[PDB]
């Protein structure tokens, strides 16, 4: 069968289906990945209560961020511009 043996994880595979949530990003991205995989939450018992997945709203440091890092670093750099 074509395109069947060479299945690899796609682009940004931990942080593809991560929804933009600021409440609990690791708790919500694990649930959005749980239903995108097709697994019903009633079929899984305690395996779906406490779990975490990499979200796009969390940096490499443990800090929940709204917009990305390059335009959060740019917020500090655009505010720190004295008149030349």
DSSP 15-27: SSS----SS-HHH
Residues 6+ apart with CB under 8 A from 44: 34
Q: How many CB atoms lie within 10 A of CB 69?
A: 11
Contact call for residues 69 and 59 (beta carbons, < 8 A): yes
Contact call for residues 42 and 35 (beta carbons, < 8 A): no
Which residues make beta-bridge pairs with 58? 64
Dihedral pair phi/psi, residue 58, rounded to 5°: -115, 135
Residues 6+ apart with CB under 8 A from 22: 57, 64, 66
CA dist., res. 14 & res. 31, Å (int): 13
Resolution (A): 3.4
């Amino acid at each position: 069968s074509p395109a069947d043996t060479n299945v690899v994880p796609a682009k940004d595979a931990p942080t593809t289906n991560s929804p933009p949530s600021t409440t609990s990003p690791n708790q919500a991205a694990a649930d959005a990945n749980q239903q995108q995989a097709g697994i019903v939450s009633s079929q899984s018992g305690p395996n779906a209560v406490g779990d975490s997945a990499p979200s796009s709203s969390v940096n490499n440091d443990g800090d929940i961020i709204t917009r990305p890092t390059s335009d959060s670093i740019a917020a500090v750099a655009n505010a720190t511009k004295p008149a030349a």
